[PDB]
């Protein structure tokens, strides 16, 4: 059973890490790259990219622990702790040499800091559509002179008593089309098809409670990257963000300056925060272009 | 048929104001003091200060609009429209007389403009527990390093799609308990039979919507309160607030210096958001004080 259409030429397959198994999808051939998915999706928001990218490379887009067709975590939702097991999945395909990194929203949180402490694993980094766990995220506003602020589930999601659960648990498809729209410039790409796909998917129990355990320990990850973030990334790095509704804006870049020393970054207009699918051409375009070099 | 229990001399009764139905809490004799309760309550948050205060005044205790036993406004849910109702449902009981007025949580919103633009109608003026509408609102966290933010819930309830209705319905006692209890210092004085009460009046489908409609209303308030604040208050003003877990502790009078002329202020240590509950007896005890000299 697969959640999601696995694109030709590639296959999905399970591997066990720490005790734990992970759902993936691999294709193409050549020096490694890992796409990290993010909150309210899973692998396949990589679908259209893979193709492109296998053709150069080989391509793994894992399930997050917890997500997907992907197992919980054992040890725990903190960035440093989830790090772990990607570094290790990346590490059985590409065991002497280092790998390339994409990454989208919770998917940076859940990779900085493996980058961090195996900077010499990693050839070259994109990081889209998040802030890195730090004291920066204190700053953003609960309400805006627009409606509701980016980030403000944050709080819904962190809340005791499994308030967001508890809640949206048998309106999970609705809860999500708002979500994805609500963050969305370019709203007509989430059909109710692709939506349904989606719902399905994170509507699993233990999914669903994952999901917002990833925001339950992110003041754990703030406390962790603290002191990671003592040491510079020396590789190579670039980040994406919509400049559209819903959208990072410049705050991606911005933020990237005081954690990378080579750092290019791009807002792309008319996209807002689901680069892969609101924005494919350009964004796709973008990170082909810069693992190529 | 009465959703909450009467005081004692005290009579439940309505009055149509501009076409609307409005509930109200009457007692006492003399000089008329309006209590004008907030979100997730009902004019029984005043039960206890009423008995006292009706001993040197006539006290009014109106359900907002959509709220208790009142009907939907006419009109609209911003300040400057709710203001209205709660303007002319005074004056039908001081028609020759300032009187007195004392508002909690949104009940400042929807009291604010008609303060503001009828101030010869205004004796004396208590405000506590939550920001008049204005830019100021910006400014609060989305989320903080210890959790769940005090006003996460303003971009909740003002989300469209009717996303707060259709999360909590069904789950109304559940939400609200845990509202309640994440904004309060001492939660033991919420009985499961207050609760119970406060659960069952606001999810009446019609409540359960214009509780929401006031915050979809919110930015709308700010605009007409960045104009009406170019005249400044000039009535005697008390503000209080909780110093406590879930209070607004100093920001309600530093608030308030920027509105009125002649106000002091009051942060009471202990306690959380929920004032005439949590700290009924040095609440009644200060606003009582302040209205008698």
Same mark, same amino acid.
Request: glycine share 8%; net charge negative; aromatic share 12%.
């Given at each position: 059973? @697969?959640?999601?259409?696995?694109?030709?030429?590639?296959?999905?397959?399970?591997?066990?890490?720490?005790?734990?198994?992970?759902?993936?999808?691999?294709?193409?051939?050549?020096?490694?790259? #890992?796409?990290?998915?993010?909150?309210?999706?899973?692998?396949?928001?990589?679908?259209?990219?893979?193709?492109?990218?296998?053709?150069?490379?080989?391509?793994?887009?894992?399930?997050?622990?917890?997500?997907?067709?992907? @197992?919980?975590?054992? !040890?725990?939702?903190?960035?440093?702790?989830?790090?772990?097991?990607?570094?290790?999945? $990346?590490?059985?395909?590409?065991? &002497?040499?280092?790998?390339?990194?994409?990454?989208?929203?919770?998917?940076?949180?859940?990779?900085?800091?493996?980058?961090?402490?195996?900077?010499?694993?990693?050839?070259?980094?994109?990081?889209?559509?998040?802030?890195?766990?730090?004291?920066?995220?204190?700053?953003?506003?609960?309400?805006?002179?627009?409606?509701?602020?980016?980030?403000?589930?944050?709080?819904?999601?962190?809340?005791?008593?499994?308030?967001?659960? !508890?809640?949206?648990?048998?309106?999970?498809?609705?809860?999500?089309?708002?979500?994805?729209?609500?963050?969305?410039?370019?709203?007509?790409?989430?059909?109710?098809?692709?939506? &349904?796909?989606?719902?399905?998917?994170? $509507?699993?129990?233990?999914?669903?409670?994952?999901?917002?355990?990833?925001?339950?320990?992110?003041?754990?990850?703030?406390?962790?990257?603290?002191?990671?973030?003592? !040491?510079?990334?020396?590789?190579? !790095?670039?980040?994406?963000?919509?400049?559209?509704?819903?959208?990072?804006?410049?705050?991606?870049?911005?933020? #990237?300056?005081?954690?990378? @020393?080579?750092?290019?970054?791009?807002?792309?207009?008319?996209?807002?925060?689901?680069?892969?699918?609101?924005?494919?051409?350009?964004?796709?375009?973008?990170?082909?272009?810069?693992?190529?070099?």
């Amino acid at each position: 059973a @697969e959640e999601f259409p696995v694109p030709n030429g590639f296959e999905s397959a399970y591997r066990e890490v720490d005790g734990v198994k992970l759902h993936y999808v691999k294709g193409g051939q050549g020096p490694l790259v #890992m796409l990290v998915h993010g909150f309210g999706q899973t692998w396949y928001e990589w679908h259209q990219l893979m193709p492109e990218l296998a053709k150069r490379f080989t391509v793994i887009a894992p399930d997050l622990p917890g997500l997907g067709q992907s @197992e919980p975590p054992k !040890t725990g939702y903190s960035g440093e702790q989830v790090a772990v097991y990607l570094h290790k999945l $990346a590490r059985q395909f590409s065991p &002497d040499r280092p790998f390339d990194l994409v990454a989208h929203d919770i998917g940076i949180w859940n990779t900085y800091p493996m980058v961090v402490k195996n900077q010499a694993d990693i050839a070259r980094l994109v990081y889209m559509e998040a802030p890195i766990p730090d004291a920066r995220i204190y700053r953003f506003p609960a309400f805006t002179a627009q409606g509701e602020s980016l980030v403000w589930h944050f709080s819904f999601f962190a809340a005791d008593d499994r308030l967001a659960e !508890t809640l949206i648990a048998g309106k999970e498809r609705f809860f999500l089309e708002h979500f994805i729209k609500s963050h969305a410039s370019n709203t007509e790409v989430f059909s109710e098809r692709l939506l &349904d796909l989606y719902a399905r998917s994170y $509507a699993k129990p233990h999914s669903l409670n994952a999901s917002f355990e990833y925001y339950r320990a992110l003041n754990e990850s703030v406390r962790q990257n603290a002191e990671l973030a003592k !040491t510079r990334l020396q590789m190579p !790095t670039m980040t994406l963000a919509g400049g559209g509704h819903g959208g990072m804006g410049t705050f991606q870049l911005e933020q #990237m300056k005081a954690y990378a @020393e080579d750092v290019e970054g791009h807002v792309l207009p008319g996209c807002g925060h689901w680069l892969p699918e609101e924005c494919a051409a350009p964004m796709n375009r973008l990170v082909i272009d810069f693992l190529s070099r």
